[PDB]
Design a protein around this ligand. Sequence first.
Ligand SMILES: CC(C)C[C@H](C(=O)NO)N(Cc1ccccc1)[P@](C)(=O)c1ccccc1
Ligand SMILES: [Ca+2]
Ligand SMILES: [Ca+2]
Ligand SMILES: [Ca+2]
Ligand SMILES: [Ca+2]
Ligand SMILES: [Ca+2]
Ligand SMILES: [Ca+2]
Ligand SMILES: [Zn+2]
Ligand SMILES: [Zn+2]
Ligand SMILES: [Zn+2]
Ligand SMILES: [Zn+2]
Lengths: 173, 169
Amino acid sequence: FRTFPGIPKWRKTHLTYRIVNYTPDLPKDAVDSAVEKALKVWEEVTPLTFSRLYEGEADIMISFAVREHGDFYPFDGPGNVLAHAYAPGPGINGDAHFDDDEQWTKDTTGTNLFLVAAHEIGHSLGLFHSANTEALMYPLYHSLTDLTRFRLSQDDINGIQSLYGPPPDSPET
Amino acid sequence: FRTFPGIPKWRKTHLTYRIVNYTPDLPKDAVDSAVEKALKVWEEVTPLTFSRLYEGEADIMISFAVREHGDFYPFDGPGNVLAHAYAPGPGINGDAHFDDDEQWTKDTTGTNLFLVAAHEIGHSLGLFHSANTEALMYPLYHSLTDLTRFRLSQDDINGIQSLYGPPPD
Ligand SMILES: CC(C)C[C@H](C(=O)NO)N(Cc1ccccc1)[P@](C)(=O)c1ccccc1
Ligand SMILES: [Ca+2]
Ligand SMILES: [Ca+2]
Ligand SMILES: [Ca+2]
Ligand SMILES: [Ca+2]
Ligand SMILES: [Ca+2]
Ligand SMILES: [Ca+2]
Ligand SMILES: [Zn+2]
Ligand SMILES: [Zn+2]
Ligand SMILES: [Zn+2]
Ligand SMILES: [Zn+2]
Protein backbone atom coordinates (compact mmCIF):
# COMPACT_ATOMS: atom_id res chain seq x y z
CA PHE A 1 0.00 0.00 0.00
CA ARG A 2 1.02 3.59 -0.75
CA THR A 3 -0.25 6.96 0.52
CA PHE A 4 0.07 10.46 -0.99
CA PRO A 5 3.17 12.63 -0.23
CA GLY A 6 2.93 14.37 3.14
CA ILE A 7 0.39 11.76 4.21
CA PRO A 8 -2.58 14.10 3.94
CA LYS A 9 -5.51 12.71 5.86
CA TRP A 10 -8.72 14.23 7.18
CA ARG A 11 -8.77 15.53 10.74
CA LYS A 12 -12.49 14.92 11.27
CA THR A 13 -13.75 11.32 11.67
CA HIS A 14 -17.08 12.38 10.22
CA LEU A 15 -17.05 13.59 6.63
CA THR A 16 -19.79 14.87 4.36
CA TYR A 17 -20.39 13.97 0.74
CA ARG A 18 -22.56 15.43 -1.97
CA ILE A 19 -23.58 13.97 -5.31
CA VAL A 20 -23.39 17.11 -7.46
CA ASN A 21 -24.91 15.79 -10.69
CA TYR A 22 -26.20 12.57 -12.29
CA THR A 23 -25.35 10.27 -15.20
CA PRO A 24 -27.74 9.35 -18.06
CA ASP A 25 -26.67 5.65 -17.70
CA LEU A 26 -28.35 4.86 -14.41
CA PRO A 27 -31.50 5.96 -12.64
CA LYS A 28 -30.80 8.29 -9.72
CA ASP A 29 -31.53 5.58 -7.12
CA ALA A 30 -28.80 3.29 -8.52
CA VAL A 31 -26.19 6.04 -8.32
CA ASP A 32 -26.98 6.99 -4.71
CA SER A 33 -26.94 3.32 -3.76
CA ALA A 34 -23.57 2.60 -5.34
CA VAL A 35 -22.10 5.69 -3.66
CA GLU A 36 -23.42 4.69 -0.23
CA LYS A 37 -22.04 1.19 -0.58
CA ALA A 38 -18.63 2.53 -1.66
CA LEU A 39 -18.31 4.71 1.45
CA LYS A 40 -19.65 1.87 3.57
CA VAL A 41 -16.73 -0.41 2.70
CA TRP A 42 -14.39 2.09 4.35
CA GLU A 43 -16.57 2.85 7.40
CA GLU A 44 -16.59 -0.87 8.23
CA VAL A 45 -12.83 -0.85 8.85
CA THR A 46 -12.24 2.67 10.31
CA PRO A 47 -13.80 5.10 12.83
CA LEU A 48 -15.05 7.12 9.84
CA THR A 49 -18.70 7.91 9.22
CA PHE A 50 -20.33 9.81 6.32
CA SER A 51 -23.45 11.98 5.92
CA ARG A 52 -25.16 13.48 2.90
CA LEU A 53 -25.44 17.16 1.98
CA TYR A 54 -27.75 18.37 -0.78
CA GLU A 55 -26.51 21.96 -0.97
CA GLY A 56 -23.34 23.77 0.11
CA GLU A 57 -19.80 22.38 0.13
CA ALA A 58 -19.27 18.82 1.38
CA ASP A 59 -15.79 17.34 1.96
CA ILE A 60 -16.18 14.82 -0.87
CA MET A 61 -17.93 16.35 -3.87
CA ILE A 62 -18.96 13.65 -6.30
CA SER A 63 -19.78 14.34 -9.94
CA PHE A 64 -19.76 12.83 -13.40
CA ALA A 65 -17.77 14.53 -16.17
CA VAL A 66 -16.54 14.31 -19.79
CA ARG A 67 -13.35 15.76 -21.33
CA GLU A 68 -12.62 19.29 -20.01
CA HIS A 69 -14.66 19.81 -16.92
CA GLY A 70 -13.23 22.55 -14.77
CA ASP A 71 -10.20 20.99 -13.08
CA PHE A 72 -6.50 20.45 -13.96
CA TYR A 73 -7.01 16.95 -15.42
CA PRO A 74 -9.32 16.35 -18.43
CA PHE A 75 -10.94 12.94 -19.08
CA ASP A 76 -9.88 10.88 -22.15
CA GLY A 77 -13.16 9.68 -23.64
CA PRO A 78 -14.35 6.05 -23.83
CA GLY A 79 -11.94 3.62 -22.17
CA ASN A 80 -8.64 4.15 -20.35
CA VAL A 81 -9.14 6.48 -17.33
CA LEU A 82 -12.56 5.72 -15.83
CA ALA A 83 -12.36 8.15 -12.91
CA HIS A 84 -10.16 10.31 -10.67
CA ALA A 85 -10.16 11.54 -7.08
CA TYR A 86 -8.02 13.83 -4.97
CA ALA A 87 -6.16 13.36 -1.67
CA PRO A 88 -7.65 14.91 1.48
CA GLY A 89 -7.56 18.64 2.14
CA PRO A 90 -9.79 21.69 1.48
CA GLY A 91 -11.71 22.58 -1.62
CA ILE A 92 -10.94 20.51 -4.70
CA ASN A 93 -9.27 17.97 -2.44
CA GLY A 94 -11.19 14.81 -1.54
CA ASP A 95 -13.47 15.16 -4.57
CA ALA A 96 -14.30 12.22 -6.85
CA HIS A 97 -15.05 12.74 -10.55
CA PHE A 98 -16.36 9.89 -12.76
CA ASP A 99 -15.84 9.76 -16.55
CA ASP A 100 -19.27 9.75 -18.18
CA ASP A 101 -17.87 8.51 -21.50
CA GLU A 102 -17.94 5.10 -19.79
CA GLN A 103 -21.15 3.05 -19.38
CA TRP A 104 -21.78 3.11 -15.63
CA THR A 105 -23.58 0.02 -14.44
CA LYS A 106 -25.07 -1.60 -11.32
CA ASP A 107 -23.67 -4.97 -12.40
CA THR A 108 -20.66 -6.00 -14.55
CA THR A 109 -21.89 -5.29 -18.10
CA GLY A 110 -20.07 -2.00 -18.41
CA THR A 111 -18.06 -0.26 -15.73
CA ASN A 112 -19.39 -0.96 -12.22
CA LEU A 113 -19.98 2.35 -10.42
CA PHE A 114 -19.60 0.81 -6.95
CA LEU A 115 -16.24 -0.83 -7.62
CA VAL A 116 -14.62 2.30 -9.01
CA ALA A 117 -16.29 4.56 -6.44
CA ALA A 118 -14.80 2.39 -3.69
CA HIS A 119 -11.38 2.81 -5.34
CA GLU A 120 -11.91 6.59 -5.59
CA ILE A 121 -13.17 7.08 -2.05
CA GLY A 122 -9.93 5.40 -1.06
CA HIS A 123 -8.10 8.22 -2.82
CA SER A 124 -10.40 10.80 -1.21
CA LEU A 125 -9.43 9.35 2.18
CA GLY A 126 -5.70 9.21 1.60
CA LEU A 127 -4.65 6.03 -0.20
CA PHE A 128 -2.59 6.14 -3.38
CA HIS A 129 -2.22 3.19 -5.75
CA SER A 130 -1.02 -0.06 -4.21
CA ALA A 131 1.80 -2.30 -5.33
CA ASN A 132 -0.27 -5.29 -4.17
CA THR A 133 -2.02 -7.00 -7.11
CA GLU A 134 -5.26 -7.97 -5.35
CA ALA A 135 -5.83 -4.77 -3.41
CA LEU A 136 -8.78 -2.59 -4.35
CA MET A 137 -6.24 0.25 -4.56
CA TYR A 138 -4.24 -1.51 -7.29
CA PRO A 139 -4.47 0.69 -10.47
CA LEU A 140 -6.04 -1.98 -12.67
CA TYR A 141 -9.82 -2.20 -13.12
CA HIS A 142 -10.63 -5.56 -14.63
CA SER A 143 -12.82 -8.54 -15.46
CA LEU A 144 -14.64 -9.03 -12.13
CA THR A 145 -17.85 -11.10 -12.00
CA ASP A 146 -18.89 -11.26 -8.32
CA LEU A 147 -19.99 -8.18 -6.34
CA THR A 148 -21.47 -10.77 -4.00
CA ARG A 149 -17.90 -11.75 -3.12
CA PHE A 150 -16.69 -8.23 -2.33
CA ARG A 151 -14.32 -8.04 0.60
CA LEU A 152 -11.65 -5.40 0.98
CA SER A 153 -8.22 -7.03 0.89
CA GLN A 154 -5.88 -7.08 3.87
CA ASP A 155 -3.63 -4.54 2.18
CA ASP A 156 -6.43 -1.97 1.82
CA ILE A 157 -7.40 -2.53 5.44
CA ASN A 158 -3.78 -2.15 6.60
CA GLY A 159 -3.49 1.02 4.50
CA ILE A 160 -6.61 2.90 5.54
CA GLN A 161 -6.06 1.84 9.17
CA SER A 162 -2.51 3.24 9.12
CA LEU A 163 -4.19 6.62 8.64
CA TYR A 164 -7.40 6.30 10.64
CA GLY A 165 -7.08 3.07 12.59
CA PRO A 166 -9.79 0.37 13.08
CA PRO A 167 -13.32 1.15 14.35
CA PRO A 168 -13.62 1.74 18.13
CA ASP A 169 -16.39 -0.83 18.43
CA SER A 170 -14.23 -3.48 16.73
CA PRO A 171 -12.07 -6.06 18.47
CA GLU A 172 -8.68 -6.74 16.95
CA THR A 173 -7.73 -10.31 16.14
CA PHE B 1 4.69 -0.46 17.19
CA ARG B 2 1.18 0.90 16.66
CA THR B 3 -1.37 2.27 19.09
CA PHE B 4 -5.16 2.40 18.50
CA PRO B 5 -6.71 5.67 17.18
CA GLY B 6 -7.13 8.31 19.85
CA ILE B 7 -4.50 6.30 21.78
CA PRO B 8 -6.95 4.84 24.29
CA LYS B 9 -5.33 3.37 27.39
CA TRP B 10 -6.34 2.52 30.95
CA ARG B 11 -6.44 5.49 33.27
CA LYS B 12 -5.21 3.31 36.16
CA THR B 13 -2.28 0.99 36.98
CA HIS B 14 -4.18 -1.85 38.63
CA LEU B 15 -6.37 -3.99 36.38
CA THR B 16 -8.60 -6.94 37.09
CA TYR B 17 -9.23 -10.06 35.02
CA ARG B 18 -11.80 -12.86 35.07
CA ILE B 19 -11.77 -16.17 33.22
CA VAL B 20 -15.50 -16.51 32.56
CA ASN B 21 -15.48 -20.02 31.06
CA TYR B 22 -13.19 -22.91 30.16
CA THR B 23 -12.23 -24.87 27.06
CA PRO B 24 -12.88 -28.62 26.78
CA ASP B 25 -9.45 -28.98 25.05
CA LEU B 26 -7.32 -28.46 28.13
CA PRO B 27 -7.39 -28.90 31.91
CA LYS B 28 -8.43 -25.85 33.93
CA ASP B 29 -4.95 -25.43 35.52
CA ALA B 30 -3.32 -24.86 32.11
CA VAL B 31 -5.82 -22.18 31.05
CA ASP B 32 -5.20 -20.26 34.28
CA SER B 33 -1.44 -20.63 33.86
CA ALA B 34 -1.46 -19.63 30.21
CA VAL B 35 -3.43 -16.50 31.12
CA GLU B 36 -1.32 -15.69 34.21
CA LYS B 37 1.94 -16.09 32.24
CA ALA B 38 0.38 -13.87 29.58
CA LEU B 39 -0.39 -11.18 32.18
CA LYS B 40 3.12 -11.46 33.55
CA VAL B 41 4.88 -10.73 30.25
CA TRP B 42 3.34 -7.26 30.35
CA GLU B 43 3.65 -6.66 34.12
CA GLU B 44 7.42 -7.19 34.00
CA VAL B 45 7.92 -4.21 31.70
CA THR B 46 5.32 -1.74 33.06
CA PRO B 47 3.98 -0.55 36.43
CA LEU B 48 0.77 -2.54 35.69
CA THR B 49 -0.39 -5.06 38.31
CA PHE B 50 -3.30 -7.52 38.05
CA SER B 51 -5.81 -9.29 40.28
CA ARG B 52 -8.27 -12.08 39.55
CA LEU B 53 -12.02 -11.84 40.15
CA TYR B 54 -14.49 -14.74 40.16
CA GLU B 55 -17.71 -12.70 40.10
CA GLY B 56 -18.68 -9.22 38.94
CA GLU B 57 -17.29 -7.32 35.97
CA ALA B 58 -13.52 -7.34 35.68
CA ASP B 59 -11.63 -4.98 33.37
CA ILE B 60 -10.43 -7.86 31.22
CA MET B 61 -13.11 -10.52 30.85
CA ILE B 62 -11.68 -13.68 29.29
CA SER B 63 -13.80 -16.37 27.61
CA PHE B 64 -13.90 -19.10 24.97
CA ALA B 65 -16.40 -18.86 22.13
CA VAL B 66 -17.57 -20.37 18.85
CA ARG B 67 -19.34 -18.63 15.93
CA GLU B 68 -21.92 -16.11 17.25
CA HIS B 69 -21.34 -15.29 20.90
CA GLY B 70 -22.00 -12.09 22.83
CA ASP B 71 -21.02 -9.65 20.03
CA PHE B 72 -21.24 -8.38 16.41
CA TYR B 73 -18.11 -10.25 15.38
CA PRO B 74 -18.64 -14.03 15.09
CA PHE B 75 -15.72 -16.46 14.95
CA ASP B 76 -14.97 -18.34 11.70
CA GLY B 77 -14.60 -22.06 12.46
CA PRO B 78 -11.22 -23.91 12.59
CA GLY B 79 -8.07 -21.89 11.91
CA ASN B 80 -7.75 -18.32 10.62
CA VAL B 81 -9.11 -16.00 13.34
CA LEU B 82 -7.85 -17.63 16.56
CA ALA B 83 -9.11 -14.98 18.96
CA HIS B 84 -9.93 -11.28 19.26
CA ALA B 85 -9.63 -8.59 21.95
CA TYR B 86 -10.99 -5.06 22.50
CA ALA B 87 -9.04 -1.86 23.25
CA PRO B 88 -9.16 -0.22 26.73
CA GLY B 89 -12.42 1.17 28.10
CA PRO B 90 -15.56 0.07 30.01
CA GLY B 91 -17.88 -2.79 29.19
CA ILE B 92 -16.90 -5.11 26.37
CA ASN B 93 -13.71 -3.05 26.02
CA GLY B 94 -10.56 -4.78 27.24
CA ASP B 95 -12.30 -8.16 26.88
CA ALA B 96 -10.58 -11.10 25.20
CA HIS B 97 -12.50 -13.79 23.34
CA PHE B 98 -10.92 -17.10 22.24
CA ASP B 99 -12.08 -19.37 19.38
CA ASP B 100 -12.84 -22.86 20.71
CA ASP B 101 -12.97 -24.25 17.18
CA GLU B 102 -9.20 -24.15 17.60
CA GLN B 103 -7.35 -26.82 19.54
CA TRP B 104 -5.82 -24.91 22.45
CA THR B 105 -2.65 -26.59 23.76
CA LYS B 106 0.04 -25.68 26.26
CA ASP B 107 2.76 -26.64 23.77
CA THR B 108 3.22 -26.11 20.00
CA THR B 109 0.93 -28.96 18.87
CA GLY B 110 -2.20 -26.94 18.29
CA THR B 111 -2.90 -23.26 18.82
CA ASN B 112 -0.76 -22.30 21.85
CA LEU B 113 -3.02 -20.50 24.37
CA PHE B 114 -0.20 -18.60 26.15
CA LEU B 115 1.15 -17.04 22.93
CA VAL B 116 -2.28 -15.99 21.72
CA ALA B 117 -3.30 -14.72 25.15
CA ALA B 118 -0.18 -12.58 25.38
CA HIS B 119 -1.02 -11.04 22.01
CA GLU B 120 -4.69 -10.51 22.84
CA ILE B 121 -3.91 -8.89 26.17
CA GLY B 122 -1.64 -6.63 24.19
CA HIS B 123 -4.76 -5.45 22.41
CA SER B 124 -6.59 -5.17 25.76
CA LEU B 125 -3.90 -2.79 27.07
CA GLY B 126 -3.78 -0.51 24.02
CA LEU B 127 -1.42 -1.98 21.42
CA PHE B 128 -2.62 -2.35 17.83
CA HIS B 129 -0.61 -4.34 15.22
CA SER B 130 3.14 -3.87 14.71
CA ALA B 131 5.12 -3.94 11.45
CA ASN B 132 8.11 -5.58 13.14
CA THR B 133 8.30 -9.23 12.13
CA GLU B 134 9.76 -10.56 15.39
CA ALA B 135 7.35 -8.69 17.69
CA LEU B 136 4.50 -10.33 19.59
CA MET B 137 2.08 -7.73 18.20
CA TYR B 138 2.79 -8.67 14.57
CA PRO B 139 -0.16 -10.50 12.95
CA LEU B 140 1.90 -13.61 12.16
CA TYR B 141 3.33 -13.99 15.71
CA HIS B 142 2.11 -17.61 15.46
CA SER B 143 5.61 -18.91 14.65
CA LEU B 144 7.54 -17.74 17.73
CA THR B 145 9.11 -20.51 19.85
CA ASP B 146 6.64 -19.70 22.69
CA LEU B 147 8.35 -20.90 25.90
CA THR B 148 11.89 -21.97 25.18
CA ARG B 149 13.01 -19.01 23.10
CA PHE B 150 10.15 -16.63 23.87
CA ARG B 151 11.19 -13.11 24.73
CA LEU B 152 9.11 -9.94 24.44
CA SER B 153 10.82 -7.96 21.68
CA GLN B 154 12.13 -4.48 22.43
CA ASP B 155 9.41 -3.26 20.05
CA ASP B 156 6.58 -4.54 22.25
CA ILE B 157 8.41 -3.16 25.29
CA ASN B 158 8.73 0.24 23.61
CA GLY B 159 5.09 0.12 22.62
CA ILE B 160 3.63 -0.75 26.00
CA GLN B 161 5.97 1.64 27.88
CA SER B 162 4.89 4.51 25.61
CA LEU B 163 1.49 4.08 27.20
CA TYR B 164 2.39 3.03 30.73
CA GLY B 165 6.04 3.76 31.43
CA PRO B 166 8.90 1.47 32.56
CA PRO B 167 8.65 -0.51 35.80
CA PRO B 168 8.74 1.71 38.89
CA ASP B 169 11.87 -0.16 39.97
C1 LIG C 1 -4.03 8.45 -12.79
C2 LIG C 1 -5.43 7.97 -12.45
C3 LIG C 1 -6.46 8.96 -12.97
C4 LIG C 1 -5.69 6.60 -13.09
C5 LIG C 1 -7.06 5.93 -12.90
C6 LIG C 1 -7.33 5.66 -11.40
O1 LIG C 1 -6.60 4.92 -10.71
N1 LIG C 1 -8.28 6.37 -10.79
O2 LIG C 1 -8.09 6.54 -9.39
N2 LIG C 1 -7.11 4.72 -13.77
C7 LIG C 1 -5.92 3.82 -13.89
C8 LIG C 1 -5.27 3.81 -15.25
C9 LIG C 1 -5.69 4.63 -16.37
C10 LIG C 1 -5.02 4.51 -17.66
C11 LIG C 1 -3.92 3.57 -17.81
C12 LIG C 1 -3.49 2.75 -16.68
C13 LIG C 1 -4.17 2.87 -15.40
P1 LIG C 1 -8.67 4.01 -13.76
C14 LIG C 1 -8.85 2.94 -15.26
O3 LIG C 1 -9.63 5.10 -13.97
C15 LIG C 1 -9.14 2.99 -12.29
C16 LIG C 1 -10.48 3.14 -11.75
C17 LIG C 1 -11.01 2.20 -10.77
C18 LIG C 1 -10.20 1.09 -10.31
C19 LIG C 1 -8.86 0.95 -10.84
C20 LIG C 1 -8.32 1.88 -11.81
CA1 LIG D 1 -13.54 18.69 -1.22
CA1 LIG E 1 -12.23 7.48 -20.04
CA1 LIG F 1 -22.18 7.52 -19.58
CA1 LIG G 1 -14.13 -5.02 30.04
CA1 LIG H 1 -11.23 -19.61 13.86
CA1 LIG I 1 -11.40 -26.47 21.04
ZN1 LIG J 1 -11.82 15.93 -12.57
ZN1 LIG K 1 -6.92 5.22 -8.75
ZN1 LIG L 1 -3.86 -9.11 16.89
ZN1 LIG M 1 -16.15 -11.67 20.57
